């Protein structure tokens, strides 16, 4: 082998993990969701605020522990790939100079080259966009025969941003085909055709509309008589609605956004934020199960942290983009680095802990050192599995690490969003060991943390 599939372990229905008496309840109360929704609006609209600028980028808006100089990050990214060999989108070795043409097109000597007088660089996403660390659709893969490498691990791929996302326009490539933007806690390059600037009137009118959000993962927007293409509406989008018809921003001939009314008779959406009931969380969780794992949002399929950010956005609860920032900045992190497997299971299974964990409101994160994270999921409580009570989580994992007798690595592949035991694949440890593969249990991760969400920053 090397990459070895493992079966799905537990029932793929969030309602299996919700007691009947909780069905009709909300997970958090009115006061708490109001505070979370206010925080969401501050973070989500930060690029339209007077506080934001074209030089500084925050993984968590207004938290200066997360502040970065954009030009430095751009130069760091160029340097990172100039210094490396890898493989392209067709699995062919990159030419030795392939970054040079990209660096030229980035034209950083003119940074930032999009003027911003009267806040004219405020903008919006008009087509769902794959945010890229460099302005190229070409990939950077490590050797695709190495477990954990090849597709979907294109390291240029950073995030998936949905139509409607408030952004700021920073800098345009020399060929004008790419624009460097920031929004939703992400910085990077997108096709220029996927974004548009917005004017003061656009923002004023945006704030007067009722907003809606889709209730299914993907759906097709109507193709009108003169449309050239179908458009896909993705869960997580937040868009105006008037008289029951969705409005979507489209790029006008002058490059600015204007709202277009969509014929909405067959569309599936609801007023945003969605009510944070156990029922609604269950429906939304169920809609993501089976979505392929997409590193960095590759091909509009989410990764571990992107899945959670997306789910919570439907409810007006804001998480940062990546697992480390979620674990450390969505709440007060509790590190179990100094605690044994037995102690970790005592907390998550029996709730024997110094703290109280909350199903559907606690992130569990895992990593290879005390402070780093390489996986995250949403704690969902416990279930009976193989006549044992096990802790469970909603998550998007790629695969669990395996090691053979020669200390070579492998993966027990999952590759899709699922509800899983915390110890993904632990049930298969004995069978794997008989074929000389030792599964590295998530319960034994060097870094292992819980973060409650119920405290808004
Ligand atoms: Cl920012
Ligand atoms: Cl994403
Ligand atoms: Cl487990």
Q: Please tell me how large the radius of gyration is.
A: 22 Å
- Report the helical percentage: 10-25%
Largest sheet, in brief, is:
6 strands, antiparallel
Structural class: alpha+beta
Which strand-content bin applies to the residues?
25-35%
* Gross geometry: globular
PDB class: hydrolase
Keywords: NlpC/P60, D, L-endopeptidase, hydrolase
Assembly: monomeric
Entry title: Insights into a novel NlpC/P60 Endopeptidase from Photobacterium damselae subsp. piscicida
Structure description:
With 457 residues, this protein is of the alpha+beta class. It has 2 domains: 3-27 and 277-452, Alpha-Beta Complex (endopeptidase fold (from Nostoc punctiforme)); 32-271, no CATH class. It contains 9 helices and 26 strands. The protein has a 6-stranded antiparallel beta sheet with strand order 18-26-19-20-21-24. A 5-stranded antiparallel beta sheet has the order 9-8-7-4-10, with no helix packed on it. A 5-stranded antiparallel beta sheet has the order 16-15-14-11-17, with no helix packed on it. It starts with a strand and ends in a 5-residue tail after the last strand. The chain binds chloride ion (3 copies). One chloride ion binds at residues 52, 57-58, 61, 182. One chloride ion (CL) binds at residues 159-160, 297, 302, 306. The PDB classes it as hydrolase. The entry lists the keywords cell wall hydrolases, Crystallography X-Ray, D, L-endopeptidase, hydrolase. It forms a monomeric assembly. The entry is titled "Insights into a novel NlpC/P60 Endopeptidase from Photobacterium damselae subsp. piscicida".
